[PDB]
Design a protein around this nucleic acid. Structure first.
Lengths: 151, 93
RNA sequence: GCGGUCCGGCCGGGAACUCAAAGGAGACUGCCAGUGAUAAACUGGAGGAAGGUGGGGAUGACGUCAAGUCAUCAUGGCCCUUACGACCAGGGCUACACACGUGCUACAAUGGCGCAUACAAAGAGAAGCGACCUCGCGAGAGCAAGCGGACCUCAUAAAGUGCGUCGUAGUCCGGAUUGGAGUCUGCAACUCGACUCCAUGAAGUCGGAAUCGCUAGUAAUCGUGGAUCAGAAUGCCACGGU
């Protein structure tokens, strides 16, 4: 940061609904500067079928986040070369920007063509912390304790 | 009952059975199978025995099956090897 | 809005109502607060159908670079020619147990098929596109006439939807080549070309080193097309996309 200023931009939260768990909302992986149709199949993950599910229509977003929490990870700056990670406590700014990427990946595992069939094996019978949504909970703690002693 | 010559249709229907063979495909299964009153949504094990022998002769008359595929089908390449034609002269080198 | 229908506004007829023609619109940090050497300038928020060169396109300094394609005619030069000039049959710009430089055949867990609904974006319109009915089981080869035009066509157009079979197979997941019949575009298939049927199926299960593509309509792959029209797009002055 010799001269670069650090600003997290944020133009608008989801239109139909929205929570405060989105640190930066910005168009990416799509045309930027135009927001005609970025919200079509984004809201397809609260409940795939009302009949085949005994959970809530709003609490399902919070149950898929408390089970995926990285205890001790590396930092993206990596100013020095080789393998030297400066211990930096996970910042609350990291748990709201890239934390939403691991939620969809946890519900996306079986090879299909319809994203909706994957939800019938990850939310209708695996949202009670069965063990398919803990792939990033114990993996972060297991990787640590090794590179803590570097600076 | 053995409907095909090569194998026997088990746990299948009458349309998907005559598909992997070379003699009958997607366009030949709608000319002799729909000539008589037979349902396609019913399994083979739940059909009448009186209409099984009537459909066996339909795929045997003027229709090459799996056993006759080596007997008469092909077997022309070997008989026309003496006569030279432009085609064999461009696909040899 | 308001009257008949074929229910595609096919025509009686009205405007501010999904678009228009010689001309004028129009959205540019415009106002306030905070911050900033009070200026310049930045991150939000009242209005409003369009907020941060709105977006896209025409648009493009020899200040670097003597190195870029002269298979546009020496193009005011300098030049060469009967055997470096010509009509041309035949010796011929010839990939043979076929290696990504101009043409996608392939990449073989991304495989194939009969089934009762309003919207039409493009393209074309005096030596040219062709109505409708009849008619076309593979490729080919055809029947048939309003109209010198707001009435046809190119254009039969890969994915989706979704009981199986097959089992991590040397093949039902596929269709290079070794070997065999025809039509058409035709002096002309001998050498050296394209549309459609075939059996034995040969190398293969996602990849060494080196090297390298990816950010103001980003993307993957078995797919089209008005243009030259001898062999009827995959390569894009285009158009239309899930």
């Amino acid at each position: 940061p010799r001269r670069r200023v650090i600003g997290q931009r944020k133009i608008l939260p989801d239109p139909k609904f929205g929570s405060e768990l989105l640190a930066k909302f910005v168009n990416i992986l799509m045309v930027d500067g135009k927001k005609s149709t970025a919200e079509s199949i984004v809201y397809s993950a609260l409940e795939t079928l009302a009949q085949r599910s005994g959970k809530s229509e709003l609490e399902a977003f919070e149950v898929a986040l408390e089970n995926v929490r990285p205890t001790v990870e590396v930092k993206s700056r990596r100013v020095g070369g080789s393998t030297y990670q400066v211990p930096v406590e996970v910042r609350p700014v990291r748990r709201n920007a890239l934390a939403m990427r691991w939620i969809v990946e946890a519900a996306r595992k079986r090879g299909d063509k319809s994203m909706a069939l994957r939800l019938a094996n990850e939310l209708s019978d695996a949202a009670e912390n069965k063990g398919t949504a803990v792939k990033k909970r114990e993996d972060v703690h297991r990787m640590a304790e090794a590179n803590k002693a570097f600076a | 009952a053995r409907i095909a010559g090569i194998n026997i249709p088990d746990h299948k229907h009458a349309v998907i059975a005559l598909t992997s063979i070379y003699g009958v495909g997607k366009t030949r299964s709608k000319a002799i199978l729909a000539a008589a009153g037979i349902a396609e949504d019913v399994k083979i094990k739940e059909l009448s025995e009186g209409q099984i022998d009537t459909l066996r002769d339909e795929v045997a008359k003027f229709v090459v099956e799996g056993d006759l595929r080596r007997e008469i089908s092909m077997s022309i390449k070997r008989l026309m090897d003496l006569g030279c034609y432009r085609g064999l002269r461009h696909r040899r080198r």
